[PDB]
Design an enzyme around this catalytic site. Structure first.
Site, PDB file in Angstrom:
ATOM      1  N   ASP A 136       4.490  -6.181   2.316  1.00  0.00           N
ATOM      2  CA  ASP A 136       3.588  -6.272   3.472  1.00  0.00           C
ATOM      3  C   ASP A 136       2.310  -5.461   3.249  1.00  0.00           C
ATOM      4  O   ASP A 136       1.209  -5.910   3.598  1.00  0.00           O
ATOM      5  CB  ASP A 136       4.350  -5.778   4.709  1.00  0.00           C
ATOM      6  CG  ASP A 136       3.725  -6.175   6.052  1.00  0.00           C
ATOM      7  OD1 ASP A 136       2.710  -6.886   6.113  1.00  0.00           O
ATOM      8  OD2 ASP A 136       4.268  -5.726   7.080  1.00  0.00           O
ATOM      9  N   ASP A 184       4.757 -12.529  10.120  1.00  0.00           N
ATOM     10  CA  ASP A 184       3.727 -12.280  11.129  1.00  0.00           C
ATOM     11  C   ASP A 184       3.387 -13.521  11.940  1.00  0.00           C
ATOM     12  O   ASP A 184       2.301 -13.588  12.523  1.00  0.00           O
ATOM     13  CB  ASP A 184       2.456 -11.723  10.475  1.00  0.00           C
ATOM     14  CG  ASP A 184       2.518 -10.219  10.285  1.00  0.00           C
ATOM     15  OD1 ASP A 184       3.046  -9.531  11.181  1.00  0.00           O
ATOM     16  OD2 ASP A 184       2.038  -9.722   9.247  1.00  0.00           O
ATOM     17  N   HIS A 197      -4.145 -10.693   9.927  1.00  0.00           N
ATOM     18  CA  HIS A 197      -2.750 -11.126  10.086  1.00  0.00           C
ATOM     19  C   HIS A 197      -2.709 -12.641  10.300  1.00  0.00           C
ATOM     20  O   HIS A 197      -2.495 -13.150  11.405  1.00  0.00           O
ATOM     21  CB  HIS A 197      -2.076 -10.388  11.241  1.00  0.00           C
ATOM     22  CG  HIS A 197      -1.839  -8.928  10.982  1.00  0.00           C
ATOM     23  ND1 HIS A 197      -2.604  -7.933  11.559  1.00  0.00           N
ATOM     24  CD2 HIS A 197      -0.909  -8.294  10.225  1.00  0.00           C
ATOM     25  CE1 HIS A 197      -2.169  -6.753  11.155  1.00  0.00           C
ATOM     26  NE2 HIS A 197      -1.140  -6.941  10.346  1.00  0.00           N
TER      27      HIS A 197
HETATM   28 MG   LIG Z   1       3.562  -7.507  11.263  1.00  0.00          MG
HETATM   29 ZN   LIG Z   2       2.398  -8.101   7.838  1.00  0.00          ZN
END
Ligand SMILES: [Mg+2]
Ligand SMILES: [Zn+2]
Ligand SMILES: COc1ccc(CNc2nc(N3CCC[C@H]3CO)ncc2C(=O)NCc2ncccn2)cc1Cl
EC number: 3.1.4.35
Length: 324
Positions: A229, A119, A78
């Protein structure tokens, strides 16, 4: 500003064709950070956002560098590259998947910002850990804890001096865009995807899905955020294999933290001892989370089929690996 900005701002921005960013199969592995910033400029440009919203070149460059800077370079998955790839998948779904024809430029503006920002300041642990550890963020937000924080970070950067890529919007467009961004970032909480996807799937199954309905429109943008995502699960196998390394590294690192700091045994998903089970776990995730989403998306745009195709091929490879 800094030397990085000066380099970025003066650089020639190659075409989307040159940069390969319209390909669903796009990979960032051979790209420098600077080239990922040029890719990002190209995305804003070819979605007509720079021109339609009167973005100054230096402001967009500073904003992109501010976003990249506020991802952590010691979080295995991430990080900036995950956000960049999510935005690249959004670009490809909009262009190659032709979804841009069904959305306004104001919606696309919010989606691209949200994809890039969704994120921000991720710390390599999930909401369950933040809650269990009594992290300060868990005292601020009851649900979707990290995602509320990602939006806070997103808004802070959008408001920073020299970074105000939305300065050209009128106040009513600005308010609407911020609200779509917030919903879009909150949508990347898998918990919210799981709660809301049943309605989307049934509307699609019955052929009752109507993008003109504002509620269904918001639902669709949430599903599209999740689709981008998760899109590493659709990549060609060489890419997917490598992204899986990062996901596992970050998961197992949380498991180590839970043992050392919380004195609890992690679930199999985060237990390095169970690494030989990753193939079966990838198959389980594809069946439970991924396949119906990419299947439903192709009913919205048939040209998004390469995502579904790529997902099916990875399930084949992972299931073969699980059978050992
Ligand atoms: Mg996330
Ligand atoms: Zn993500
Ligand atoms: C230990 O190592 C792994 C362990 C499991 C998996 C497969 N499971 C996921 N895989 C991804 N990623 C992101 C990119 C594509 C894919 C990696 O291929 N993300 C999230 C999960 C996941 O299970 N979340 C928990 C959850 N699931 C359902 C409902 C609620 N909560 C992959 C790896 Cl590597």
């Amino acid at each position: 500003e800094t030397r990085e900005l000066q380099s970025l701002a003066a650089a020639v921005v190659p075409s989307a064709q040159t940069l390969k960013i319209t390909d669903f199969s796009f990979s960032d592995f051979e790209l420098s950070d600077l080239e990922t910033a040029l890719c990002t400029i190209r995305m804003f440009t070819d979605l007509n956002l720079v021109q339609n919203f009167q973005m100054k070149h230096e402001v967009l460059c500073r904003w992109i560098l501010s976003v990249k800077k506020n991802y952590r370079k010691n979080v295995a998955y991430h990080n900036w590259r995950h956000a960049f790839n999510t935005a690249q998948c959004m670009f490809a779904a909009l262009k190659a998947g032709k979804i841009q024809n069904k959305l306004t430029d104001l919606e696309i503006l919010a989606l691209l910002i949200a994809a890039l920002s969704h994120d921000l300041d991720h710390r390599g642990v999930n909401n369950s850990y933040i809650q269990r550890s009594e992290h300060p963020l868990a005292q601020l937000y009851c649900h979707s804890i990290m995602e509320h924080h990602h939006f806070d970070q997103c808004l802070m950067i959008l408001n920073s001096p020299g970074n105000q890529i939305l300065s050209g919007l009128s106040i009513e467009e600005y308010k609407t865009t911020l609200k779509i961004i917030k919903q879009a970032i909150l949508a990347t909480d898998l918990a919210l995807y799981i709660k809301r996807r049943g309605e989307f799937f049934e509307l699609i199954r019955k052929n009752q899905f109507n993008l003109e309905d504002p509620h269904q429109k918001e639902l669709f943008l949430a599903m599209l955020m999740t689709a981008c995502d998760l899109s590493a699960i659709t990549k060609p196998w060489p890419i997917q294999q490598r992204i899986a390394e990062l996901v596992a590294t970050e998961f197992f690192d949380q498991g180590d933290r839970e043992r050392k700091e919380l004195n609890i045994e992690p679930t199999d998903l985060m237990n390095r001892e169970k690494k030989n089970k990753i193939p079966s776990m990838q198959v389980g995730f594809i069946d439970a989370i991924c396949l119906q989403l990419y299947e439903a998306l192709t009913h919205v745009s048939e040209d998004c089929f390469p995502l579904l195709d790529g997902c099916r091929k990875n399930r084949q490879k992972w299931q073969a690996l699980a059978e050992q």
